[PDB]
Write a protein that holds these residues in place. Structure first.
Motif: not given
Ligand SMILES: Nc1ncnc2c1ncn2[C@@H]1O[C@@H]2COP(=O)(O)O[C@H]3[C@@H](O)[C@H](n4cnc5c(N)ncnc54)O[C@@H]3COP(=O)(O)O[C@H]2[C@H]1O
Ligand SMILES: Nc1ncnc2c1ncn2[C@@H]1O[C@@H]2COP(=O)(O)O[C@H]3[C@@H](O)[C@H](n4cnc5c(N)ncnc54)O[C@@H]3COP(=O)(O)O[C@H]2[C@H]1O
Ligand SMILES: [Mn+2]
Ligand SMILES: [Mn+2]
Lengths: 314, 759, 191, 96, 90, 90
Positions: D61-77
């Protein structure tokens, strides 16, 4: 009112496409237009009961030459017959051949007629077999054409002549009918000459035979196996709707059947004189280069003795 | 073009003269020319001249001075062609005011969708529809038994978009792919393409006729059987209805082209389907009586909805006489191991083919299908990949690839289905505004058991009613309430009951105990009274008695099918009443639609009279209107097109009316649209005395007239203040009031154009 | 966790380059090279389920290290493929919160739990706990609407072209950027 | 005023406050797979893995998942904000 | 219809998808540089303007031989996909 | 700061999510009827205004006892979720 022809597909654009459509609706025939992509807005598309895009992907001109797409559309839509108009595919052997083969009436002569007259030479030929004059380069000639109609039942009329002598860089500009500056005798020698040729090959539907004239001789030069731009001026002096005639002929009737109403040759006469001027976007202040753009104002004219046949000027 | 004709002189626009060598010839040209004319802005006398010229007494040549005043056929005029004007009225209205219930936003620039290239005049394979026509229901059944591969029903044209897009997919978008469907997917067992929420949604929200969809499609896909989803008791409707209504609906459905009827009851009460089932048999069609899956047969704690339960009912349904046994897993609750066991057992138990239908809500759809396939299931419901997943069906191509190396395969052409899929990939973008299902697994459905559709839907109401913050509370209550009802099958309409009560209990801080304690003082939602009244059948195991008593308040629950107890409808009476309301002869179909949805049927009629058959519009135009300078092509019928362009949008006058400036097939057209949502002062044309303008600087106290009012010279038009001392602006002549540029309140200067008074 | 990237299709003998013997040879060299865990990285979601059973089975017969599988749910067969892998002995699998799972992501952690909880072999997870975490992501995902651009539905075409999870959305972007959005199918054929 | 680069510039929406799991105050994180590594190293974790009959889960969830679905844009906050809960509520994961 | 230049200027048009004389932006970004003037003659493939997409420059070309017409954007302007940029008459 | 009524009027504010004195629309729709005036006293649960959602009327209530303040909408107005409608001071 019509025997076989219930629906016509008009395989052209512009002025002549609208002319045919108007003749079809007068005879209670359904019309189908075709347009290129580029012509998506041409007003001839709004004059037919049906319209379909043709030539998808081809160049502007090639798109109106897409024989097989045209046949697809003809068939898809239930078109008994195709009027090819003038220019484009109107004089094209493969296209006529190809309609005949599909049992789709080609509103014109038979394919073999386009063959013997598609060539500049095999025409010369046919004119010799007809026993009419020809050239063997001529001084200050008049350019003079004769309108012929001929049905499937071996009747063949002429509708007198047109003087197409006013030309610019060998392209017609004003046409006058009849040729006011020749004698009644010359007029008949020329007219009979063209009947002779067209009977000699059992010519079918509307066609035109061109002649050059010097003083008191004349010389065959060409046959156009189609309607012409200037047919208008002939309808005006003779009274005979040429385009309806075309349709009637191709349906199967005979010139004089009371519905078609073409008089006997003896009863066809000249009434008055008519002039045609073609209004184009050719700019004379720029070497006759065609202008382009939106036409913001277009207001034609009217009154007695005036006729208008609209192309893409609306 | 652009002239203003006035009422002072004669009306003459133009003298049209035609000529022939004969009268007869001239008459044909007059005919053509009158018809070919286009004049818009003002009415003309053309319809009348045509009648004259077409009359055979005109053609005969023999008429006299009393020809007209004694040929009354000359004054009957056809029904006007103003389809263009209507289309423009629709487009202009959505463009200025937006489409109702969606955020009003610029129309996007869309890709043209990828249509599969079919050879011209190619050759549709026979399929399952031919078997039915030749050998009937038993023939198809026997066929099914012969097939080793698992068969596919495609739900793309119904349950798929019901689930993902609020059933908003429009007939135009469906017709456009149907041809290809027929050619490229001939091996499908069936196309689920009607029923469910499509019947009312077509009328109510899409302004189109479901029957037209069913009938147009029938011709377009003549090789594959059409399936529908039918609620047994209430058909596709919103009520209960008397038996003859159900039988008439089914009869017509069957004539119109539906071949397979999946028939279910929301409480699995077999009595509730008995009319429908019988009606389907009698029409010569396939019956797919269905059992709704709920609970969890792998869990023995749970003793009510067990494998023996499904087996007993499977037999009764064969006894009741179903050709195919359908298992309808509305909520996606059937886990995979339970699928293997359930389908296996049911195959050991009954000698009919089995048709499975699940939802991919949990993410285990395909896996569950693979289990079902290992155990012998005959047919499964899938959808185009681009309309599959989440609360829809599993992917048809997903399945093919997952099974193509197993002991048991599907008969599908991957490549073909991928090409079809592209069409949907593209078209789905049109429905962004309705694509609101959070489209990712929700395993919580194993706790709460809310069906595919109603989750997105119930959330909406929760949000609507100010409870969006507390959605988890409501999902917990939904579960509580199912227990309060003794654990029922939840699917339309039993599901609504559970959702209605769940909302109410949360809204009003009501626990379960609160309801048992203070229940006789509480007024429960109508669907709950109706439920306990027995108005949607009898739940397995029966109502909980204490809770029933509290809800009904002495009311006496019936114990039979509500259709037994209902006055049969009089079709002759109802058809006449409708004829009256519509103003012409309705079809057998109009009538049944009015019976099933009286209000929405009439609202549909009102709508198509105002705007014509808006069905024909491309979906982006249907929902968003037109951009300035955009051109669209509206196909009225094959070959017959309205090239429409939008040039500009006039400023508003006082009541909000704007002029919308269009070109339609070359003809400039101006249509008046009232702007409902308005967030520079015109001066007079000094020349024109039809303009009434302010004399001095001041304001408008009162406007005394409305547009269209008749006035006589001297009459009061409006009253204008000049330093508080009122003065009254009068009509400068007899005439009719036109546009009004000001309102009570408005401040004004000298020269300011106030009112227009036409002569 | 040295990893082997899965490509091709070992259920298809026409294809002779990337075969089960290929994966077995390399599995051994990697143990020789000294990996604690053998990872199988199915970047494109190409590993069909029956091939998973066979591949993981064989690799378990062949090497004495635990195996860690990673696929993408691109085709819609992720979970099914995981269930096969689980039947054959796989030690560890990669999943994601439901709200960030599916399509070109990993299969759902809760999806998997529920699909296996009645099988011969289970996952150690607390559904309820993972559902509560999941809600956080359900909400937070909305923040990223502008980057949530993957068309999020099965694409079985990846079995033809073999573009990884990520690069599909990405390559499409450039195609569109450079005026080729109309011709994306041509480009997938060319790939 | 100028928008964020590479996205369409549009009014900021009105967002739900996200649902944070309720953790008892000063509750007690289970040891997991990280402790095994600290005590017994790589071989310890491997041996452990061999002992487990259940299939183990790595969460992406904290890496490949959002790399795939959200252009790896999920932010540390957004990641820190759930991490505590992650620790308490998902202690059985093989890895993150 | 007469053309008057407004010397004292103090809504984004989208393309007509039908018409290929319309050249419109492909993605969201901005205009670095407009390389042409109204009335310029172009040959297919020539450079009309340059558009940024997250700082990485890309070059919008003539889709055919023709003549440049109206230009709806300037160096600086921010752009979205569908936005009509330049018109190239045949 | 002084309040002047503009007699001659010829952008939608969203709510401050923090502040519960702000009453904002729940879904996209329009305003049928505003039932209160500025300065009206209300008791929790009372009717403030009525909002349409696809023609089906629904009623926005006071979330507490208090006093009505500014009103940002009128009978007619079209509304979206988040749109600030009425303010109710405690
Ligand atoms: N022989 C058998 N015994 C028990 N379950 C079976 C079975 N064959 C298939 N299944 C069920 O079906 C699922 C998928 O099998 P595959 O191979 O398509 O996981 C299995 C299991 O749940
Ligand atoms: N004994 C066996 N033989 C062959 N394949 C098996 C198998 N057990 C499981 N599988 C594979 O794993 C899939 C799912 O089994 P379940 O039960 O989890 O579908 C099957 C099949 O592809
Ligand atoms: Mn369903
Ligand atoms: Mn990966």
């Amino acid at each position: 009112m019509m025997n076989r022809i219930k629906k016509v597909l008009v395989a052209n654009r512009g002025e002549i496409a609208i002319r045919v459509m108007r003749a079809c609706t007068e005879l209670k025939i359904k019309t189908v237009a075709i347009y290129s992509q580029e012509d998506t807005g041409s007003f001839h598309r709004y004059k037919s009961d049906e319209a379909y895009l043709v030539g998808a992907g081809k160049k502007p001109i090639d798109a109106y030459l897409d024989i097989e797409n045209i046949i697809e559309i003809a068939k898809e839509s239930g078109a008994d017959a195709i009027h090819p108009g003038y220019g484009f595919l109107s004089e094209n052997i493969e296209f006529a051949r190809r309609c005949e083969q599909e049992g789709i009436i080609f509103v014109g002569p038979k394919s073999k007629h386009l063959d013997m007259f598609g060539d500049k030479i095999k025409a010369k030929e046919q004119a010799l077999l007809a026993d009419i004059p020809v050239i063997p380069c001529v001084m200050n000639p008049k350019h003079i054409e004769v309108q012929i109609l001929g049905d499937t039942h071996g009747n063949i009329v002429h509708l007198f002549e047109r003087d197409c002598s006013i030309q610019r860089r060998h392209q017609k500009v004003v046409e006058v009918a009849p040729c006011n500056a020749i004698t009644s005798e010359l007029r008949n020698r020329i007219c009979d000459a063209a009947v002779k040729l067209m009977k000699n090959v059992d010519y079918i539907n509307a066609g035109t035979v061109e002649f050059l004239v010097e003083g008191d001789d004349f010389y065959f030069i060409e046959v156009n196996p189609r309607v012409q731009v200037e047919h208008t001026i002939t309808e005006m002096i003779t009274g005979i709707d040429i385009v309806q005639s075309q349709l009637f002929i191709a349906d199967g009737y005979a010139l004089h059947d009371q519905l078609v109403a073409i008089p006997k040759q003896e009863d066809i006469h000249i009434h008055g004189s008519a002039i045609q001027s073609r209004i184009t976007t050719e700019d004379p202040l720029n070497n006759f280069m065609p202008d382009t753009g939106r036409v913001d104002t277009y207001r034609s004219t009217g009154g007695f003795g005036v006729r208008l046949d609209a192309g893409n000027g609306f | 073009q652009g002239t203003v004709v006035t009422p002072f002189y004669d009306s003459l626009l133009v003298k049209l003269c035609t000529w022939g060598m004969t009268f007869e010839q001239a008459t044909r040209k007059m005919r053509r020319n009158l018809i070919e004319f286009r004049i818009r802005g003002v009415k003309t006398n053309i319809p009348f001249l045509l009648n004259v010229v077409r009359h055979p007494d005109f053609a005969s040549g023999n008429y006299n001075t009393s020809f007209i005043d004694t040929t009354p056929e000359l004054f009957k005029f056809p029904h006007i062609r103003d389809r263009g004007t209507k289309t423009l009225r629709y487009i202009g209205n959505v463009t200025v005011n937006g489409f109702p219930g969606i955020k009003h936003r610029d129309k996007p620039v869309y890709a043209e969708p990828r249509l599969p290239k079919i050879p011209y005049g190619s050759q549709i394979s026979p399929g399952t529809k031919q078997i039915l026509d030749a050998k009937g229901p038993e023939g198809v059944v026997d066929w099914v038994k012969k097939q080793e591969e698992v068969l596919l029903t495609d739900t793309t044209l119904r349950d798929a978009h019901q689930s993902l897009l609020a059933t908003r997919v429009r007939s135009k978008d469906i017709f456009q792919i149907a041809d290809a469907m027929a050619h490229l997917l001939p091996n499908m067992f069936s196309f689920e393409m009607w029923g469910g929420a499509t019947f009312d949604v077509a009328y109510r929200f899409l302004n189109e006729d479901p029957w037209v969809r069913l009938e147009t499609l029938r011709k377009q896909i003549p090789n594959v059987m059409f399936q529908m989803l039918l609620r047994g008791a209430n058909a596709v409707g919103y009520k209960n209805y008397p038996d003859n209504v159900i039988r008439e609906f089914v009869k017509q459905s069957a004539q119109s082209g539906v071949d397979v009827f999946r028939v279910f009851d929301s409480l699995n009460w077999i009595k509730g389907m008995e009319v429908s089932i019988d009606a389907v048999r009698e029409a010569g069609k396939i019956v797919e009586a269905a059992i709704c899956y709920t609970g969890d047969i792998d869990d023995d704690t749970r003793t009510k909805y067990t494998i023996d339960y499904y087996k007993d009912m499977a037999k009764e349904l064969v006894a009741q006489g179903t050709h195919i046994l359908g298992i309808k897993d509305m909520a996606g609750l059937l886990k995979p191991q339970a699928a293997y066991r359930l389908i296996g057992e049911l195959k050991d138990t009954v000698d009919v083919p089995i048709h499975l239908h699940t939802h991919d809500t949990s993410g285990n759809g395909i896996y569950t299908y693979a289990a079902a396939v290992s155990a012998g299931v005959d047919i499964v419901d899938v959808a185009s990949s681009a309309m599959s997943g989440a609360t829809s069906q599993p992917s048809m191509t997903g399945l093919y690839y997952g099974l193509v190396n197993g002991n048991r395969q599907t008969n599908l052409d991957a490549q073909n289905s991928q090409i079809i899929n592209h069409y949907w990939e593209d078209v789905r973008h049109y429905y962004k505004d309705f694509d609101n299902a959070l489209n990712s697994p929700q395993t919580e459905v194993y706790i709460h058991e809310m069906p595919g559709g109603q989750y997105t839907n119930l959330q909406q109401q929760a949000i609507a009613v100010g409870l969006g913050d507390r959605w988890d509370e409501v999902k917990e209550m939904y579960t509580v309430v199912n227990q309060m009802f003794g654990d029922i099958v939840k699917v339309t309409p039993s599901s609504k009951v559970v959702g209605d009560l769940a909302l109410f209990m949360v809204q009003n801080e009501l626990s379960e105990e609160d309801v048992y304690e203070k229940g006789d003082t509480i007024d429960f939602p109508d669907s709950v009274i109706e439920f306990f009244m027995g108005e949607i059948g009898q739940p397995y195991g029966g109502f909980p008695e204490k809770l029933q008593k509290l809800v009904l308040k002495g009311r006496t629950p019936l114990t039979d099918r509500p259709g037994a107890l209902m006055e049969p409808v009089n079709f002759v009476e109802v058809k006449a009443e409708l004829k009256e309301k519509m103003g012409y002869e309705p079809t057998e179909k109009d009538v049944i639609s009015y019976i099933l949805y009286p209000k929405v049927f009439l609202d549909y009629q009102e709508m198509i009279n105002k705007y014509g058959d808006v069905t024909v519009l491309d979906t982006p135009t249907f929902y968003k209107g037109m951009r300035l300078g955009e051109t669209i092509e509206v196909e009225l019928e094959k070959g017959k097109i309205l090239l429409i362009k939008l040039n500009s949008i006039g400023e508003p006058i006082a009541d909000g009316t704007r002029v919308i400036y269009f070109e339609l097939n070359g003809q400039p057209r101006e249509i008046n649209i009232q702007d409902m949502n308005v967030q520079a002062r015109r001066k007079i044309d000094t020349t024109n005395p039809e303009h009434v303008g302010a004399t001095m600087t001041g304001s408008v106290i009162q406007v005394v007239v409305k547009k269209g009012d008749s006035v006589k010279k001297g009459d009061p038009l409006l009253i204008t203040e000049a330093m508080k001392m009122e003065t009254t602006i009068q009509a400068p002549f007899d005439g009719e009031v036109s546009s009004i540029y000001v309102s009570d309140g408005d401040t004004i200067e000298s020269g300011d154009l106030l009112i227009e008074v036409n002569r």
